[PDB]
Design a protein around this ligand. Structure first.
Ligand code: G6Q
Ligand code: G6Q
Ligand code: GLU
Lengths: 657, 663
C-alpha cells in the first residue's frame, strides 16, 4: 500500500492543482498497491477558502490509479477553480489482499457520515475486533470490514471525551495509538483542526518532505515528551511552506529532496505551518528523479532488465579494484574479522531474494568453507529454526521491509547471531536493525517483478565471498578468475540483451501453452526456479522449475512431445550430467528449448531451438542464463495481453502478513 | 534386470517342473520393468539325465514372461517328462541398454553356436568395446549388439587358453571379471561343468537361497583366496546330498521356496560344485541369514493393483515399522539398530538428511520435529545437488541417508562422500543388505515390507515414523520434553486407526478425482508441517497421473505465485489445527479474494472451514508432527483414482530410464 498527502501552507493552489498533486503522488506509489485508491480533501464551492475547511469530500474507486483519476475528473458538483491558500489533502493506494477492493474498503476511512475525522493507514491493527466491539457499544456504527475504520472511529471517541476544549490534535492521536496494536503508518485530517496534519508510525515507513523558497529554521527537529520557535521546523521570515507525507520516497523526490524519516512512536504534527515531532534529523536524499522514470522504455520492467549492465557496475562501484584485484565492502569493514570467526552462514529471504541465495550458496561454501544454509523466511519462522551466537545471518531484501524477512531478523538477534543486511533501501528496517550490511546500490526498482535487484544481490554476495577468502594463498587464482569475470560481465550482459528479438520469436511459439517446465542443476538450479517464478508472476502460465538431477525420480513422467521444456546446459563441471538430463527429456519425445554456451557446438547442432549465451566464470554464469528468462517472461506477457509492471493479484513488497 | 536360477541337486525334478520354476521366478521380477526374457536349460530327450548335460537349449523372446511361458510349452522337440536328478536352469528379464529388444539380444547370451557357455547379466560393462575388439581379433564372432555377449565370449577364451585340463569353473570366471569394468550381477552355466553354477557381482545385488530337508554344514560360509575346498569350507547337506539352490538378484523370487539366503558382496565368486557351495575372493565369511519376508507381501491379494494395496495397507505397515521399538506399556522408544551409536550421535553438533525424490520429502516432513527434539541444526539435502556443490561436511556431523531401495546412485555417492569426511553415517532403508545399509556406520530398517508399486506410498509414511522415533530417542533424557514425548507416542498409538479413518473417505476422494478428471494443472498449497505434504502429493500426481501438479509454500503466495490464482485454476489447500492455523486461513482468504475456489484438506472438527468451503476432505485430528501422515494419504489416493479414471495402469512405470545405445 501507499500513503501520500500534500499540505500547501500559504502557497496558493487551485483545487485542480491539489488533486493533480495527489493523483501524481499515488501514481508514484501505485506499484505498492493498485487494487483500489482514494483521496480526501476539503469540499465546498465558497470563493473564500476559509469557509470550506469545515467540509471534507472523499472520492474513492475500485481499480488502478487511472480509475480514480477519471473519477476525480468529470465531477459535476466539485468546482476545481477554487484557490486554497491553506489546504491538506490525503490520498492512498491499496493492496487489498483480503475481501473486495471496493470504494467502501478503500481509504481514507471516516469516523462518521459528516467526515469529522479521516485517516489513511498502511499496516494491520492486530486488535481491531476488540476496538470495534468497544466502539460499537459506545454508539458508533461501522460501514466497512477494514481494520483501518476502527482507527477513525477511535480518534473521534477520544475527541468526544476530551477534558479541555483545546486539546491538541497530537494529544488525540497519542491516546489513539496507545490503544492500537500491531503496525501502522497513519496520516490524520480533521475539520476541527483545519489545515493540520498528524503523521505517526509504528513498524511501517513514513517520511515527511518539505519545500520552501525561504530558509528553514533548523535541520534537526528535537523530540518532545508530554512547541516554541526553537522547537519546530518552519520557514524563518515568511510562512510559505509545502509539506509532503509519504510512505515511499519515490512520491516526494519530484518535489524536494529534503525529507525527515520518522521513527517508531514519533508523532509528527503540522500546526500553523510548523512541523514538530512529539513522543529527528533532516536528510538530503541521493535519489534522482530520472531513476524512477521509464525513460524511453514502455515499461519499468523492461528498463530495469536492459539497465542491468549499468546497475551491475553500480553495485561494484567503489568496491572492486580490478587493477590490484581487491574487494572492499565498506559496510562490512568493522565486522568482517568477526564474521570470519563464526562457524555457519544462514541466508534468509523470500521469493526472488531467496533465489539469489540459492544462486550463490555454492561459491559461498567454496570460498568461505563454512556451512551455508538458505531458508525461506516464512518457513524459517514456522519451524523455530535453531540459531546460535556464532551464526552469521544474512537478510536479503530489496525493500528492507518484507515482514517475514524482518521477523526472521529479530528472531536471530534475540539468539545472539551476527546479522548482515543485503538491501536496496537505505532507510529500511532491515538495514537499520542489522549489525552491518551492504547497500546493493542497484537504484530504485519500480517493476513489481524483481530483475536488477536479483543480479545486484547475486553480485553483492559474490563480492562478500571474495573478501572472505582474501587471505588464502591457495585461492588467489580463483579470486582473480572471478574478478576478471566481473570486469567482463557488463559487456556480456549487453551481448545477451542483443538477443531480445530472437527470444521474442520463441515467445510467439509458447504463449498459447498452459505449462512449461524449466530444468537446471548446480549453479543454474536458482536460474530455473527464478525463471519459473518470473513466468508465473507476469504471464500466469504454469511454469515450474525442476532440479535436473531429480527428473529420474518421478517428474520426468510429465514430459511428452506436448509439454514445453526449457533446459539450461552450461559449460561447468555438471555439463555431462546436464547432457544426460537432456537425453532423458528427448527420449520422452520432449522438444526442449536449450539455454547453452555459444561454443557448445555439440548442443547447438542437435537442438533446434537454442539460446546461445556468452561464456563466463561458472559461479557468475547464473547472471547471464537468467536474463533470457527475464526477457522471455516479458515477451510472453505482452503476447498474452498483460501488463508486465502490474501483475494481477499482488503488488511489490510484502510488508504485512 | 532380473536374474533367477534354480539348481536341484539330487532332488529329482521333471523338465516341466524345472521350467515352471524358472518362469515363476521371472514372474516375481516383472515388477522392476523389462522388454524381453529368456531361459537356459539342458536340451536332449535321453531318458538318462546324465547324457543331456552336454546340450544347452535356449528359449528367448522379446515381450512378456507370459509369451515366454507360451513359447516353452510349445516346443515340439522338447519332452517335458524327463526326470533330472541334477540340473541347473537360469532365467533372465532384460531392460535393454545396449542393443534393441530382440531374441538375439535377449539373455542368456552364449559363447558360440553350440552354447558351451551361457550367462545372464544385470548391469553394464563399460569397457565392452575394447573387449569385443580383442575377442574378434582372436577369432570370436559376435551376433548381438549387447555388452553382455563379451562376457560369454570372454569366458570361453579363458577356457580355450586354460593351462591345465582341470582348471575350475571359478578360476575361469575369476579371470573374466578381472577384465570387466562397470557394474554387473552374473550367473554362468556351461556344458564343460555340468550341474555347476557360478555367480558373482560388482555393484549389483545377487543372493543365493538354499533349501534342504537335511542339516546344513554351516550357517557362515568362509571365504577363500587364490585355503582348500573341503567339507569344513563350504555349505552342503551333511549326511545326504539332496539340496536346492536359488540364485536371484531380488529375494522376491526366492522367498516362496526358502527364507535362508546368502547375500554376496563385490568380487565374491560363488560356485556350486558337487552340490556344495563355496565363495572365493580375488576369518571373513558370508552369513546364511533368515529373511523376514513372505510371499503374501509381494502379491496383490484382493487388491486390483500394488498401488492400491500398498496405500490401503498403511495401517499395517506403520504398525510393522513400530514393532519392537515403541513400548506402549511404559511409553519408551528403542531402535536397536542405533544401540551402539546413539550416545555418539548425541555428542554431534549437526544433522544432515540426504536423499532423492520422495525419500527427500520424508526428510522435509520430519525436519521441524527433529529440530525441536534434538535442538540441533537439521539440514535437508537433495543428493544430486549435495554432490554438485561439494557441500562442507565435518567429523561431528551425523548424516542420514534415506532410501527405500538402498541403492540409489546419488544417495549412495553422497554416503561415500560423507564417509571420506569422517562423518557418522546412518542409513534409513527398506532393503536388507542393500549398499546403503551395508556402508553406513549404523542404520534402521523401516520394515514396511517390500514395495512393489511404481510410486513410494508406504515407504514414505514408514520413513516418516522411523524419523519421528529417532527424534524421540534423542530427547529421552530431557525432563522438560517428557510431556511432549508422551503426546507424540500416544499419537503413534492411535495412528493406525486414524489412517483407517482416512482410508474410509475413499469415496469422497473419488468424487474429487471426478472433478479434476479433465484438468491439466492443480496447485497444492500448505506450510509448516504440511509443506512436505504439498511437495509429495504434487510428485505423486505428476508421476502417476501425468498432470501438472505443483506444491507451493503458502507463505510464498504474495511473493509471486498467487498470480496463478483465478476462477479456472484448481487448488488444493491444507489447513490443519496446529500453530500455523491462522496463517493458513490467511492464505485461504488471499486465494478466495482472487476468485480461487480451493478444495481444503482440513481437520474433522474444524467447523468454520467446513461451512465456508464447498468441498473439504475432513481428516481426523492428530498431534501436529504426525498430521502429515494423515494429510498426504488423500493425495496418494487422488493420484490413484485420477490415473484409473484416465485409463492408466498405476502399476506400469512410465519414464523408467533413457534410450538404448545402438553404436
Ligand atoms: O518477482 C518476484 C519479487 O521480486 C518477489 O519475489 C520479491 O523478491 C519478494 O517479495 C522479496 O521482497 P524483498 O526483496 O523486498 O525482500
Ligand atoms: O515415488 C517416487 C520415487 O519413490 C522417487 O521419488 C525416488 O526415486 C525415490 O523416492 C528414491 O529412491 P529410494 O528411496 O530407493 O532411494
Ligand atoms: N546391459 C545388458 C543388461 C541390461 C540389464 O541389466 O537388463 C543388456 O542390455 O543386455
Amino acid at each position: 500500500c501507499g500513503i501520500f498527502a500534500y499540505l500547501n501552507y500559504h502557497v496558493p493552489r487551485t483545487r485542480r492543482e491539489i488533486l493533480e498533486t495527489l493523483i501524481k503522488g499515488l501514481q508514484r506509489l501505485e506499484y505498492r498497491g493498485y487494487d483500489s485508491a482514494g483521496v480526501g480533501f476539503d469540499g465546498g464551492n465558497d470563493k473564500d477558502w476559509e469557509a470550506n475547511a469545515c467540509k471534507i469530500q472523499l472520492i474513492k474507486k475500485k481499480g488502478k490509479v487511472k480509475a480514480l483519476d477519471e473519477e476525480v475528473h468529470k465531477q459535476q458538483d466539485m468546482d476545481l477553480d477554487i484557490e486554497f491558500d491553506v489546504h491538506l489533502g490525503i490520498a492512498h493506494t491499496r493492496w487489498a489482499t483480503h475481501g473486495e477492493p471496493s470504494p467502501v474498503n478503500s481509504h481514507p476511512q471516516r469516523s462518521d457520515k459528516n467526515n469529522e475525522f479521516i485517516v489513511i493507514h498502511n499496516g494491520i491493527i492486530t486488535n481491531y475486533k476488540d476496538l470495534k466491539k468497544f466502539l460499537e457499544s459506545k454508539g458508533y456504527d461501522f460501514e466497512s470490514e477494514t481494520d483501518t475504520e476502527t482507527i477513525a472511529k477511535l480518534v473521534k471517541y477520544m475527541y468526544d471525551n476530551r477534558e479541555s476544549q483545546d486539546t491538541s490534535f497530537t494529544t488525540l492521536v497519542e491516546r489513539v495509538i496507545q490503544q492500537l496494536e500491531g503496525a501502522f503508518a497513519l496520516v490524520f485530517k480533521s475539520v476541527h483542526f483545519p489545515g493540520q496534519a498528524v503523521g505517526t508510525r509504528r513498524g511501517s515507513p513514513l517520511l515527511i518532505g518539505v519545500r520552501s523558497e525561504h530558509k528553514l529554521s533548523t535541520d534537526h527537529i528535537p523530540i518532545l515528551y508530554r512547541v516554541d520557535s526553537t522547537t519546530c521546523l518552519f520557514p524563518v521570515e515568511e510562512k510559505a511552506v509545502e509539506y509532503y507525507f509519504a510512505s515511499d520516497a519515490s512520491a516526494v523526490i519530484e518535489h524536494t529532496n529534503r525529507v525527515i524519516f520518522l521513527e517508531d512512536d514519533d508523532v509528527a504534527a503540522v500546526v500553523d505551518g510548523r512541523l514538530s515531532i512529539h513522543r529527528r534529523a533532516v536528510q538530503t536524499l541521493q535519489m534522482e528523479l530520472q531513476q524512477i522514470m521509464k525513460g524511453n522504455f514502455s515499461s519499468f520492467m523492461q528498463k530495469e532488465i536492459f539497465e542491468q549492465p549499468e546497475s551491475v557496475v553500480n553495485t561494484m562501484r567503489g568496491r572492486v579494484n580490478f587493477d590490484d584485484y581487491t574487494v572492499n565492502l565498506g559496510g562490512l569493514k568493522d565486522h568482517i574479522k568477526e564474521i570470519q570467526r563464526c562457524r555457519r552462514l544462514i541466508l534468509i529471504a523470500c521469493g526472488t531474494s531467496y533465489h539469489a541465495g540459492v544462486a550463490t550458496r555454492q561459491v559461498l561454501e567454496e570460498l568461505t568453507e563454512l556451512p551455508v544454509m538458505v531458508e525461506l523466511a516464512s518457513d524459517f519462522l514456522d519451524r523455530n529454526t535453531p540459531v546460535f551466537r556464532d551464526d552469521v545471518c544474512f537478510f536479503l531484501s530489496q525493500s528492507g521491509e518484507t515482514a517475514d524477512t524482518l521477523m526472521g531478523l529479530r528472531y536471530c538477534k534475540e539468539r545472539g547471531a551476527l546479522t548482515v543486511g543485503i538491501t536496496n533501501t537505505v532507510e529500511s528496517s532491515i538495514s537499520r536493525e542489522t549489525d552491518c550490511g551492504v547497500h546493493i546500490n542497484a537504484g530504485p526498482e519500480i517493476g513489481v517483478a524483481s530483475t536488477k535487484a536479483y543480479t545486484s544481490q547475486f553480485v553483492s554476495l559474490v563480492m562478500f565471498a571474495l573478501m572472505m577468502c582474501d587471505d588464502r594463498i591457495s585461492m588467489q587464482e580463483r579470486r582473480k578468475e572471478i574478478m576478471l569475470g566481473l570486469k567482463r560481465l557488463p559487456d556480456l550482459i549487453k551481448e545477451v540483451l542483443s538477443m531480445d528479438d530472437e527470444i521474442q520469436k520463441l515467445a510467439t511459439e509458447l504463449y498459447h501453452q498452459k505449462s512449461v517446465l524449466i530444468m537446471g542443476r548446480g549453479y543454474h538450479y536458482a536460474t530455473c526456479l527464478e525463471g519459473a517464478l518470473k513466468i508465473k508472476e507476469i504471464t500466469y502460465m504454469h511454469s515450474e522449475g525442476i532440479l535436473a538431477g531429480e527428473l529420474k525420480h518421478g517428474p520426468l513422467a510429465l514430459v511428452d512431445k506436448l509439454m514445453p521444456v526449457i533446459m539450461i546446459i552450461m559449460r561447468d563441471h555438471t555439463y555431462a550430467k546436464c547432457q544426460n538430463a537432456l537425453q532423458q527429456v528427448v527420449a520422452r519425445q520432449g522438444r526442449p528449448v536449450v539455454i547453452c554456451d555459444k561454443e557448445d557446438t555439440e548442443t547447438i547442432k542437435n537442438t533446434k531451438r537454442t539460446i546461445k549465451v556468452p561464456h563466463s566464470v561458472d559461479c557468475l554464469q547464473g547472471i547471464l542464463s537468467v536474463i533470457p528468462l527475464q526477457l522471455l517472461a516479458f515477451h510472453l506477457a505482452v503476447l498474452r495481453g498483460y501488463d508486465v509492471d502490474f501483475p494481477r493479484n499482488l503488488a511489490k513488497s510484502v510488508t504485512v502478513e
